[PDB]
Amino acid sequence: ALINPQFPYAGPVPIPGPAPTETMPLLNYRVEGRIAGIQQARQFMPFLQGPHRAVAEQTYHAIGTGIQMGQTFNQPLINTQEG
């Protein structure tokens, strides 16, 4: 702010002001609020809580069976070298 003498800035907005209204009042709000609809315990989703496999491992079962059977052919006898 600058004040300049001799033209000085009025020393106030004075008493000639026009009170325009008495509408100043905010009427307090008084209220009762009830949000009470029956609630049912459940919601349907496509899927909740699953941690789906991105790849599975290979998996398997097992079997064996049979017996011990055989047809054989042997090497001929040979002269013994030494000993």
């Binding site: 009427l27 709000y29 609020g33 949000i35």
Partner: protein, 50 residues
């Protein structure tokens, strides 16, 4: 987990008609107090002329 204020507040649209207009005089439609008015639309149906 619910926003209690959100769910107990009403967001509404309503309309009404006001008459009593006269040339060069301020026609004032008072806001019906307590509501929080987000927007106002005023249609001047000038006797069927728009």
């Amino acid at each position: 987990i619910l926003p209690l204020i959100d769910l107990s507040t009403l967001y509404n649209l309503e309309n009404s008609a006001q008459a009593g207009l006269t040339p060069n005089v301020d026609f004032v439609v008072q806001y019906a107090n307590l509501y929080r008015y987000l927007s106002t639309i005023a249609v001047f149906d000038n006797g069927g002329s728009f």
